[PDB]
Amino acid sequence: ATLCLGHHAVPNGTIVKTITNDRIEVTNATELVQNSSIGEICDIPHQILDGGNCTLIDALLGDPQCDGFQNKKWDLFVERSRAYSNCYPYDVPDYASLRSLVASSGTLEFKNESFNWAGVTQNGKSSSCIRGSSSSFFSRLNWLTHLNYTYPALNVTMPNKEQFDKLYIWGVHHPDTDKNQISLYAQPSGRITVSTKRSQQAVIPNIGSRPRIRDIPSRISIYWTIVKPGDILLINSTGNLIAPRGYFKIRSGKSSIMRSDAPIGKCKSECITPNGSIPNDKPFQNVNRITYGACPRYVKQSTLKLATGMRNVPEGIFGAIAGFIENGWEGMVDGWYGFRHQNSEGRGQAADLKSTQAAIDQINGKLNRLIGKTNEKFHQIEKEFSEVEGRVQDLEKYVEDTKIDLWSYNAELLVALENQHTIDLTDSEMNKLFEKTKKQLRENAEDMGNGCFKIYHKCDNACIGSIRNETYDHNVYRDEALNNRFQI
Amino acid sequence: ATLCLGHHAVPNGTIVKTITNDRIEVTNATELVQNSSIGEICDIPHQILDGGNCTLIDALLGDPQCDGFQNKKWDLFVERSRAYSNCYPYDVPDYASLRSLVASSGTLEFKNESFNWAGVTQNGKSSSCIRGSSSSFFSRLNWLTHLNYTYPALNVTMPNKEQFDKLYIWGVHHPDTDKNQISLYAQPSGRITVSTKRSQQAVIPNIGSRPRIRDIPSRISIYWTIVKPGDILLINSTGNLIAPRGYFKIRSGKSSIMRSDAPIGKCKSECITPNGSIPNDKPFQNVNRITYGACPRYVKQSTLKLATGMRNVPEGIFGAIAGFIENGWEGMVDGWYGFRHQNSEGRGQAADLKSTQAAIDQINGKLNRLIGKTNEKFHQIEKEFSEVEGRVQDLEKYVEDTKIDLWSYNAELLVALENQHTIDLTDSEMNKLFEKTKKQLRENAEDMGNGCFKIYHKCDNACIGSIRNETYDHNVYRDEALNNRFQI
Amino acid sequence: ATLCLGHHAVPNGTIVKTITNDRIEVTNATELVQNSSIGEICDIPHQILDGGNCTLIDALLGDPQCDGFQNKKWDLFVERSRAYSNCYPYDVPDYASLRSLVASSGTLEFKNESFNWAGVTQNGKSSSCIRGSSSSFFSRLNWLTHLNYTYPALNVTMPNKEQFDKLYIWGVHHPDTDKNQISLYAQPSGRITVSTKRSQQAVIPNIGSRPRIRDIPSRISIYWTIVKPGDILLINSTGNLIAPRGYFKIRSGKSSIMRSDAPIGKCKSECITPNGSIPNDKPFQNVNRITYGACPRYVKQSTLKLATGMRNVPEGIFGAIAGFIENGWEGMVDGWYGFRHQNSEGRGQAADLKSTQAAIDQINGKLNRLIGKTNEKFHQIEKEFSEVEGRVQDLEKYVEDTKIDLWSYNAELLVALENQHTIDLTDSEMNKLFEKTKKQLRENAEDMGNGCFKIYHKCDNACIGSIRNETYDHNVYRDEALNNRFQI
Ligand SMILES: *[C@@H]1O[C@H](CO)[C@@H](O[C@@H]2O[C@H](CO)[C@@H](O)[C@H](O)[C@H]2NC(C)=O)[C@H](O)[C@H]1NC(C)=O
Ligand SMILES: *[C@@H]1O[C@H](CO)[C@@H](O[C@@H]2O[C@H](CO)[C@@H](O)[C@H](O)[C@H]2NC(C)=O)[C@H](O)[C@H]1NC(C)=O
Ligand SMILES: *[C@@H]1O[C@H](CO)[C@@H](O[C@@H]2O[C@H](CO)[C@@H](O)[C@H](O)[C@H]2NC(C)=O)[C@H](O)[C@H]1NC(C)=O
Ligand SMILES: *[C@@H]1O[C@H](CO)[C@@H](O)[C@H](O)[C@H]1NC(C)=O
Ligand SMILES: *[C@@H]1O[C@H](CO)[C@@H](O)[C@H](O)[C@H]1NC(C)=O
Ligand SMILES: *[C@@H]1O[C@H](CO)[C@@H](O)[C@H](O)[C@H]1NC(C)=O
Ligand SMILES: *[C@@H]1O[C@H](CO)[C@@H](O)[C@H](O)[C@H]1NC(C)=O
Ligand SMILES: *[C@@H]1O[C@H](CO)[C@@H](O)[C@H](O)[C@H]1NC(C)=O
Ligand SMILES: *[C@@H]1O[C@H](CO)[C@@H](O)[C@H](O)[C@H]1NC(C)=O
Ligand SMILES: *[C@@H]1O[C@H](CO)[C@@H](O)[C@H](O)[C@H]1NC(C)=O
Ligand SMILES: *[C@@H]1O[C@H](CO)[C@@H](O)[C@H](O)[C@H]1NC(C)=O
Ligand SMILES: *[C@@H]1O[C@H](CO)[C@@H](O)[C@H](O)[C@H]1NC(C)=O
Ligand SMILES: *[C@@H]1O[C@H](CO)[C@@H](O)[C@H](O)[C@H]1NC(C)=O
Ligand SMILES: *[C@@H]1O[C@H](CO)[C@@H](O)[C@H](O)[C@H]1NC(C)=O
Ligand SMILES: *[C@@H]1O[C@H](CO)[C@@H](O)[C@H](O)[C@H]1NC(C)=O
C-alpha cells in the first residue's frame, strides 16, 4: 500500500504580503482596511443634530434662521458646507475655540437671567437681521443704546448660586464712524470690563468702516466668559456693550461636531465619518481621518489582506507545504490536511480533522484579536482647514500626519508578521501530521520523500482507517512487513 | 529498556496571551505593567521642593506666605492642591507659560538691581497683602505712585552686562475707578512700554470694578521680559507701573513642576508620579500619565504578563510540548527537560542540563531587553486641566491620548509576539533533545511516537547515563539490538 | 562513503541583536541607520534658494540687502545663521507664522497696486535703511506722513477681482515720543483698521522710547491680511500707517524653509538636512530630525545592523546551524549550504544551489521591503528654538520627542524581530536540505547525528552527484547496503 499525506488547495488563491515576500498566494484572506461608506450618516446610536443652514455658532447666538435650534442637545452636531450667517455681521476672536467648547458641551440649553440695565434702551434691532419680516437681532443678545441721549454707566452683577458652570456670551459693537457711537451711545469712547473673581476681560471698540454686509459697515465682536459656582459675573461698561440675556449650561461628555454633506439615514452604525457611516468590523479604514464613535483607525493603505489559509499550491520554514509535498489537493474540500491511499481494494482520500481544526483554531484566534475590536473616540482636533493660520495650525496638521504614519506602519508590519506566521503555522501542521503518521508505522513502512509512505504489507481499508484514527497496531503486521522490506 | 523524553510542568500555571490565543497557560510569567505606587514621593535622587501653601508663581512674585522660598532651587517643584494666593489680586495673561518657564528653569535666584525711580513714591502697600501684621506687597515688585500729586514720567534703563539671560517680572495696575488712578497716579491715563533691542511690550490699564478679593476691586496684571546678554531693558511709563526690584536667573536643565498631594518621604526612587514614586524595573506602568524621571511608559492596560516558561501541561509549532509528548512531569523540579527510563535495574528520572540552560538563557535574554530599561523624561506638557480653554488645550490632550494609544498598542503586540515565541522556542528545545537522543541510538532503539524509545538491548544505569551524557557507543550493542529488533 | 551536510562560515562575522540576544554573530549584516552627510546641500532635485545675509521676512519686506530676492521662487529657502536685518527696526507679532506661511507658499512674486493715498506725503525714508548710499525704506512698504501739516483720514479699497488669494503686508509706526507723531502725522492719536468681509484688524500705535537700533528709538510692527477672491481690502486710517504697495501671491505646494550653514553643491540628492544632503537608501537616519524631501526617518540609535546572512560558526529554533552541525565551512565560498563527502575515490565539497538560493531570496525579500522605501515630507514644524516661549513651544517639542521615541522603538523592534527570523530561516534551510538528503538515501545510509550520513555501499563520484542532483536510485544499491548494514 501507499499512504500519502497532503493538504488542500484552491484553483484561484489570494495574494498577500509577508516579511520575506511582497506577493505570495494563500488559499484565502480577509481585508483589514474598510474602504467604503454607505454614504449616509446613520441616526442610531449617536444622537445626530443636522445644522442645515446654521453653523453651531449661529445657533448659539440666535440668528433668526436658527430659532429651531433653541435648547437643543446632540451627540454629534453636523455642520453643512452651505451654512451661512444671516444676521448682524460679527466675528469671534478665537472662533474655533468657542465652537469647540460648545460642540463638546453638546447642549444649547439657555436660561434667561434679568440684568438691571437701568437707564438705557434695550432690544436694539437691525435690518441686517430679519426675523419674519421685521428688523431683529440675535435672540440671545441685547443691543443696549442711549436713553434720551444719555448712556448711564452700567455696573451689574450676577452671582452663580448654582452647582454648575455658566457660559455667558456677550459682545462689543464697533461703529463704522464717530457719528454713530455718539448717535448710539451718546459718548465718544466706550469701554467694557467683564470680570469674575477668577478672570477679567476688557474691550474697547475700534471705530472704522469695514466692507458692508447686508449693508452694515459696523461689526460686532463676540466674547465669552465662564462663571464657576460661588463666583460672580460683574459687567462694568460705559457703552458699546452687546449684552447677554442669560447663560448657557456648559456640560462635559462625548459630544462633538463634524463638517459633512452626507444625508442622515434611518440605520444603525457605531462609526461616523464625513463621507457617511462605515462598518467597524475591520481594525483599519482608509475612508477618512475625521471620525466619531467606535471607529477603525485611519491608515494610508487602501487595502491590507490578512491570510486566513495556508500557502496555495494548485493542481515555509517547516518545508512541507510548497516543500517536500509537491502540491495541494483541489479535490480535498472537507478538510485542510488529509491522507490519500492506494491499497489492494483501490484508491481513496480522507480529511484529517484534528490537524485541520488545529490550523483553523489558530487562525480564528488571530481573527478574534483583530476583528471587531475598534477604539471609541469622540471630540478630537480639527483635521481640515479652509484658511492659512500659521504655527498652531502647522502643529495640528503635523500631529495628525505623524499619528497616521505611525498607525499605517503598525498596520503594514502587523499584516506582514501575521501572514508569515500563518504560512508557517499551517506548514507546521502539515509536518506534524506527517511525523505522527510515520511514527505510527514504525518498521512497517518507509518514507518515499514526497509525503508518501510505502507500506510493506497488505493494508485493507480497515487497516488504513486504523492508521487515520490512530488505532493501528504495527505489531500485527510487523513480521509480514519486515519480510517484505528486507529481502534480497 | 524504555527511555522517555519529557519536560517539567507545575500544578498551577499562569495565563498569558499570544498571537493565536487570548488565554494559554505557561509554567511562569512576569508582569510588565507597574500598577502601584508606594504613595509617597521619595526625596532621592531628585531634589524635591514642596510648595506647601504656595504656587510657584506666588513664590516667584513674593506672596508673604512664600518668603521661605526666596532663592530656592529644585529638580521637581511640587504644587499642592490646597495652595492659595494671599496678596494683592492679580492675573498673569499666559500664566501657564510663565509657570512652565520658571518650573523648567529650576531656580528662584533673584538679584536686586537699582532703578532710578526719580520723583515717585515707592513701596506701595496694601491690606490685601499682610506680611506679619502690617500692610505689605509682593516682595519682588515695587508699587510706584505719585509724589506730591506729581507722577513724573519714568524712563529707565538696565543693560545686561552679564553672560546670561535675565528674567524681569513686572506688572500693570488696573484701578477700579477713575478716582483712584487720579488718586494713585495723579493722571487720567497711564501707559507702559517695556522694551529691548529684541522685543517691545506695551500695556494700558483698563479702569473698572472687578469682584472684590480681600476687599480689592482693583487688579494687577503680570508680565515678563527676558533680556539677553548685551541687551538693555528700557522701561518708559507715565503711571500704573508695578515695577521690578531686580531680575531672576533663567537657567536650562531637567527641572519641572508637578501637582500632587502625596507626602514626601525619605527613600530612593528614580520615577515620580503625582500618586507617589513607582519602581521602574518594568517597561510599562498604568499608575499615571504624569511622570518625572526614569519612568516606565504609561499604557492603558492594567496588566500584561510576559511568559517566562514553557506551555504548562499538568499531570506549539514544533509539536512536542502539548504535542506528541502527552504531558509534563510535575515531579521534575531540577530541570525543564529530561529523561525517564525503565531498565532491568528499575525506573529513574534525570534533568537534561544543556537543553534546560538553552531555554533559560533565551528567556533571560528577552528579559534583559525588557527589564530595567526605562527612558528618562523631565519637563513635559501638562496633561490635566481644571478649566475649559479651547483649541490649544484640545491639541495638548489629543497629543497625549494619541501617544498613549500608540504605546498601549506597542505593549500589547510586544507581549503577544514574545509569548508566542517563548512557547515555540521551548517546544523547539524539547524537540531538539528528542532528535539528538534518537540519533544517538542509531539502530538500537525505535521511536514509540510518544516521546519514548524502546531500546532493544540490556541497558543498565551506566548505559542510560552514557546516553544522557552523550558517550553511548551504539556499536557496542548493535549486534544484540538488531537480533532483538528484527526477529520473527 | 560518508556524506556530510554543512553550511558556509566566514573568519570575521558581524554582531547583530535579536529578540533573545544582545550580541550574536552572523556572516554579514547591513546598516539601517544613515549616520553621515556629504556636508553640502545638493541643488538637484529641489530648487534651493540661498538666503545669504537675508532672512525670508527681510526678503519679503524688501530690506535693501535683499533686492536680489524680488519675485524669487523656491522649493527650499535656506536661511543662514549670519543673516541680519539692516533697515528700519521692526517686529512681527507672530513672526513665526508669517515666516511659515511665506516659506510654505514658495514665492515672493509681488504685484504693484495703486492706492489713492490722497493728501499725504508718500515714500518716507530713513537713514536706518540705506539703499546704495541714500536714505531709503522697505521696498514693499510705503511710509505715509503729513502733507502741509495735514494728515487727511485715509479710506481706500482694493477689490480682489482675481481668482486667487492676495497677501497684503502692512505696518504701524510707533513713534518714540509725542513730538514726532505730531511731527509725522500732525495728530495726537493714530488709528488703523484693515478689514475685509471676512476679517478685521485694528491697531493703535504705542508711543515710547525703545533702545536705539541704527539710531532709531521708534519701531514698526508688521501685520498681514489675506484677501479672498470676490473680497475687498478696506484700509481706514488716521495716521501711523505703513502702507502696502501691492500684494503677494499666496500659493500652496511643497515649499519650505530650513536654517543651515551648509554650502550648496552641484549634485543630486532627494533628502536634505541642515548638516547637508544624506543618501536615502536606508529606512532610518540619525543625522538630524530636521529634514526636507524623501528622507529616512529620524531615530536616536546611531546604528542598527540588519543580518543578511546565517549565524556565523567559524572553523536557532531548528537546531542545525550552531546545533547538530558542529561548525561552518570557511572553505565553502560558492554557496551557503552544501555537501562534503568521502568515498573510495577521495574527498570533495560542493555547494547546494537550490537551498542557497532559497535563503538568499528570502533575505533579499526582506531587504526589498526595507531599502529605498523612504517617505517624502516637506513643510513641517520647527524643531529648534533660540528663545524661551512657553506653552505652544513646549507642545511642539513634546510632539517631536514623542514621535522620535516611537520611531526609535519601531526601528529597534523591527531589526530584532527580522534578525531572529533571519537566523531561524537560515537554520531551517540547513535542516530542510539535511532531511531531503536523508529521505533520498532510504535504507542505504544511517544518520551519524552530526550532519553526516554513513553510506553502506560503494558510492563513486557519479553516485554522490546523483545524490546532489536528486537522481539517486536507492533501489540500485539497496541489496548491497542492507547486507553491509545488517551483518553480525
Ligand atoms: C470708506 O469707503 C468705503 C468703501 O468705498 C465706503 O463704503 C461704501 O459706501 C457706499 C456709499 O454708502 C456704499 O453704498 C458701499 O456699499 C460701501 N462699500 C463697502 C464695500 O463698504 C465707506 O462708507 C467709507 N467710510 C466712511 C466712514 O466714509
Ligand atoms: C459696581 O458694583 C459692584 C458690585 O455690586 C460694587 O462692588 C461692591 O461694593 C460694595 C460696597 O462697597 C462692597 O461692599 C461689595 O463687596 C462689592 N462687591 C463686589 C463683589 O465687588 C462696585 O463697587 C461697583 N463699582 C463702582 C465703581 O461703583
Ligand atoms: C529714555 O532713555 C533712553 C535711554 O537712556 C534714551 O535713549 C538714549 O538717548 C541718547 C541721547 O539721544 C542716545 O544717544 C542713546 O543712544 C539712547 N539710548 C538707547 C539705548 O536708546 C531716550 O532718548 C529717553 N527717551 C526720551 C523720550 O527722552
Ligand atoms: C475566507 O476568510 C474569511 C475571513 O475569515 C471567511 O469569513 C471566509 O468564509 C473564508 N472562506 C473560506 C474559509 O472558504
Ligand atoms: C436653507 O437656505 C436656502 C437658501 O439657499 C433656503 O431656500 C432653504 O429653505 C433653507 N433650508 C431650510 C430647510 O430652511
Ligand atoms: C474712516 O474713513 C473716513 C475717511 O474718509 C474718516 O472720516 C474716518 O476717520 C475713518 N476712520 C478711521 C478708522 O480712521
Ligand atoms: C471621503 O471624503 C474625503 C474628503 O472629502 C475624500 O477625499 C475621500 O476620497 C472620501 N473617501 C471615500 C471612500 O469616499
Ligand atoms: C518566574 O518568573 C520571574 C521573572 O523572571 C522569576 O523572577 C521567578 O523567580 C520565576 N519563578 C520560577 C522560575 O520558578
Ligand atoms: C497652610 O495654610 C493653612 C491655612 O489653611 C495654615 O493654617 C497652615 O499653617 C499653612 N501651612 C504652613 C506650614 O504654613
Ligand atoms: C464702573 O461702574 C460705575 C457705574 O456705576 C461707573 O461710575 C464707572 O464708569 C464704571 N467703569 C467702567 C469700566 O465703565
Ligand atoms: C493615580 O492618580 C490618578 C489621578 O488622580 C488616578 O485617577 C489613578 O487611579 C491613580 N492610580 C493609582 C495606582 O493610585
Ligand atoms: C553583505 O550584505 C550587504 C547588504 O545586502 C551586501 O550588499 C554585501 O555585498 C554582502 N556581502 C556578501 C554577501 O558577501
Ligand atoms: C554679507 O554681509 C557681510 C557683512 O558681514 C558683507 O561683507 C558681505 O558682502 C555680504 N554677502 C553678500 C554676498 O552680499
Ligand atoms: C518716554 O520717556 C519720557 C520720560 O522722560 C517722557 O517724556 C515720555 O512721556 C515717555 N513716554 C512713555 C511711553 O511714557
Ligand atoms: C548635524 O547637526 C546637528 C545640529 O547642529 C548636530 O548636533 C549633529 O551632531 C549633526 N550630525 C552630523 C552627522 O553631523
Residue numbers in the entry:
A (entry chain A), B (entry chain A), C (entry chain A): 11 to 325, 330 to 502
From the article:
As the major antigen of influenza virus, hemagglutinin (HA) glycoprotein is the fastest evolving protein in human H3N2 virus. HA facilitates virus entry by engaging the sialylated glycan receptor and mediating virus-host membrane fusion. Despite these functional constraints, the receptor-binding site (RBS) of human H3N2 virus is also under strong positive selection pressure from herd immunity, since it partially overlaps with major antigenic sites A, B, and D4.
We postulated that the height of its RBS has been altered with the presence of G186D mutation in Vic20 HA. The height of the HA RBS was analyzed by measuring the distance between the Cα of residue 190 (Cα190) and the phenolic oxygen of residue 98 (OH98) in the apo form. The Cα190–OH98 distance in HK68 HA with S186/E190 was around 8.9–9.2 Å, while it decreased to 8.5–8.9 Å in Fin04, HK05, Bris07, Vic11, and Mich14 HAs, all of which carry G186/D190. Interestingly, the Cα190–OH98 distance went back up to 9.4 Å, which was even larger than that in HK68 HA. Similarly, Vic20 and HK68 HAs had larger Cα186–Cα228 distance, which is another proxy for the height of the HA RBS11, than Fin04, HK05, Bris07, Vic11, and Mich14 HAs. This difference is unlikely to be an artifact of crystal packing, because the RBS is not involved in crystal packing interface of these HA structures. Additionally, the HA apo structures of Fin04, HK05, Bris07, Vic11, Mich14, and Vic20 all belong to the space group H 3 2 and have the same crystal packing. While the large height of the HK68 HA RBS helped prevent a steric clash between E190 and Sia-1, that of Vic20 HA RBS promoted the H-bond formation between N190 and the amide nitrogen of GlcNAc-3 by shortening their distance.
